Symmetry: D4
Subunit: 149 residues, 8 copies
């Protein structure tokens, strides 16, 4: 699905506030309230727009220890089953199959280093395909934002 | 600012759909349409709720090359100045001060390897504090989700 | 257990000399010999004060080769049993579960490199969960001190 | 200064409790209350005994973040000057010149990751000799003990 | 087989264009069309000249993602059988037994990172002798040429 | 410029022998001696076909030491200037800007380790941008071949 | 066995030439031909002097490729048996149990990279305890000498 | 200068004992006392035989700390100047320009870790070209021997 500058204008608007009214964007882009409705709806079926949701701040919820963990597996064919075990875990918010040293690269979000220690040892490291982990503790997270379409 | 099980119930709901009706949640948890408005508003002044926005899929917008780049600097004191230069780059969506080998650990989102090559050489590696970069290219991103509060 | 500046004053005093008399600290902080007795006793049940002991110098006892060893295990779930085997060894004075490359990070204190070689090969490396060790020999240990509460 | 089995017997006792009575040890080993006073005093002038102090638990005093930091310098001759700057930092409890990758290997003791981040950026990495740091965060410290002489 | 400067002159000529006529090189080097024919033929039986072929450009055929992959095997004796499995794959254009970290170092030529991901996971990583891969994605390939005999 | 199965059929043939007759291929695929001339000529203006050349074996010409060298630079912005110096070296047959640890990844082809040592010290490492090199020496090169389009 | 400056004087002399006559050293150090005989003989039973032998030059015997190899074993307890297999090999001239990454660090002396390749693959890498090798090829060996007692 | 089986027979003999009699070797191989004198003398002018010297054991002379040090330089062109400074150090017994991570790979022979620490800091790391050292300490040296020609 290709994308007008009308589509981009809508996305910028609704990416900053989901509740900015379609009738205000019509006035703004010089189109009808109705095309705006339809543009948005095409982008939903395209899979571009995935939902409207409140954004939350994990830190102000007391997640003081976020980290990335590189997982090294005992053998590389083990990725699909390792992944299946990891995904059952709520502390794992992201996971990637990347270049470089690691088989899997994941983010886990934890409340304390005591919590992180319990997850590593008892939830992640017990996963039988896993030979080693290397976790990179976030001490500061100054930039967090979005693609600017 | 500590939260109770009503605060969580509200969050779980509005993190799935920003647009669900305060009036349904009132019926759901057995409370007043007005306590829900207020709880949400406190979490806002708390900084727990940061906004209501539509979520977008970069893949569907043609961002086929996600990467994490680890930045190593000429000397470690250089971190504030390198950060300042990187944050002006819109292709940098995230940045972390972490443990381990790198000074700064960033995500860039790009459309192609040709684009990514242009950004590395022209925008990132032209930054004068930066000794070397190591980019980890995402081939697969099977888990992307949120803290489940 | 929280801590006055009376508590800190006592700790500084008794951390430099266990035998500095309670009746001298009373004079010094303008309290009774009896509160000092009781402050110390609360900190003992708190677990803050762990004991009074003579400090010894391993070097003047002929421990010329101290080292840290990073242990890499064949698989990560192996930590609890590896640790249980290590702890039986008197040359292992410390052990840590850390971030980074190693599964376990330990200090061993030895008299000579001939001694260190015998321990590595015959006591540590015979531990069956262990795939590799990497030992960092201390050549100089210029700072050794304490948290300053 | 070489030690016999009376010297060890004395050490083992006073390393467990600084306060045990010379008079009990005399009865224990079958010697004079006065030879024990003297043996201890020689070990003191030998530098084998360095003091009698209370031991403190950092954890109970709220030091939840222990770490080892490996320091890499811009050039290796810089070791004496970097050491001098680090030793003025009270959060650095230990420092080693070791083998392997790092120029200086230090322990810092901190209350939180927020504190540790402040010390890294503001106190440690502002040291001008220092190219990069690599900090290993302690998640667990199951063995902490002494040479058993 | 040793090599005149006549041999080199012929090779330079025919390395730039296979179709440069033998009767033009005769004029050029002051020999007969017939020795040129025979020189070339000796170099063919020597194995120096391996063929005449059109050179193609993989990039203009839409190979946007070339890479090198370092293969680490579970055990080193495994090289011959790993290699035998790899060679069945058309995306593997080169392979080397090198010094350094890797057991095998290979080039694979792919159309997209989606393609590369499918090969890694399903063709290369399924090879049972393989413990890990590390792939170095080519972002730019500015020099590609030949030995200049 | 997209290609059909006639374009591939032509390529497969002329990549094996540049000299096979357009007239045989016409009979082979059931088309005109003249459409084959034209298809080839379009692929030429497309840049898909770059030439017809004889292939040479470096081994048979006495190049016993092939190597890949990873170049690390003093600062990453230095890549264009280091590249320019390397490309003047005829022993450098290939060069890549890749991911991972190195700034530039090159192939050099040499006759002996004595030669290779002379090139490293005298021609490559004299380049002023270059902090360090890491050369991977080819001991075996069992697969060398082409994209199979 | 402790060592006079007479002992050192003899060793320097006989280390440069085994055939420098005892009666010349007597004149030189102002002692008898007979003490010199006896000094040397004590050092032999001490094990200090191990033999008199011609020194050879491997390079002028056509050993163009010397190397060090770091051996990584599948598990660390495997050292004694790995070593026993290695020692049967004539190309292995030295072996060390060292700190750092490798289980065993060895020197092998070879005539060519073709020879080195055959040894690695067929003699060293077939040793079943071995997971990986990393070989450091000597390109230049400018200093080779002796302790100066 | 190529050698036959008489040349080898001579070498094998005199590499075991420099002092065995030319007259016994003549009887042994069935040749003239005089051809043996001559063969040896050619190998001398060839540079194959470099001397006859007594071999010494460093261990028995109290060298308990052998090490290999890998030297990394600030820039790679610095190799000739760093070498020149190192070769003036008598504790450096060997030095190599090798492949892999290090610029220079050296052996130092030392009596204690206290000595080795003094040499590193005061003699080696004071060399201004040197960014960092990595020393591998020998704990065991089970194989030490010669090419068997
Ligand atoms: N995630 C993976 O297994 C990819 C692997 N680290 C590579 O680059 O080859
Ligand atoms: N980002 C930083 O500079 C922190 C550094 N990687 C450390 O662990 O010490
Ligand atoms: N000690 C451990 O297993 C922790 C591990 N090295 C990590 O950082 O993931
Ligand atoms: N601390 C040092 O500078 C010693 C260095 N890491 C070495 O092993 O050579
Ligand atoms: N390809 C190999 O197995 C060689 C190995 N990486 C070495 O240098 O020892
Ligand atoms: N060649 C480069 O500078 C790219 C670098 N190795 C990276 O991955 O970021
Ligand atoms: N050779 C060994 O196994 C020693 C090991 N590399 C260590 O330093 O712990
Ligand atoms: N000693 C050197 O500078 C050579 C370097 N280690 C390389 O492999 O390229
Ligand atoms: Mg959102
Ligand atoms: Mg104490
Ligand atoms: Mg060709
Ligand atoms: Mg000798």
């Amino acid at each position: 699905y290709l994308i007008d500058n009308l589509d981009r204008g809508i996305l910028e608007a609704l990416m900053g506030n989901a509740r900015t009214a379609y009738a205000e964007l019509a006035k703004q882009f010089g189109v009808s309230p109705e095309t705006i409705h339809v543009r948005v709806e095409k982008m939903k079926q395209a899979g571009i727009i995935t939902g409207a949701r409140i954004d939350v701040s994990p830190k102000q919820l007391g997640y003081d220890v976020g980290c990335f963990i590189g997982i090294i597996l005992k053998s590389a064919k083990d990725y699909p089953s390792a992944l299946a075990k990891l995904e059952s875990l709520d502390e794992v918010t992201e996971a990637y199959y990347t270049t470089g040293h690691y088989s899997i690269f994941i983010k886990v979000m934890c409340r304390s280093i005591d919590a992180l220690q319990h997850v590593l040892i008892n939830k992640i490291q017990t996963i039988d395909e896993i030979q080693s982990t290397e976790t990179l503790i976030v001490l500061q997270n100054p930039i967090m934002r979005t693609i600017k379409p």
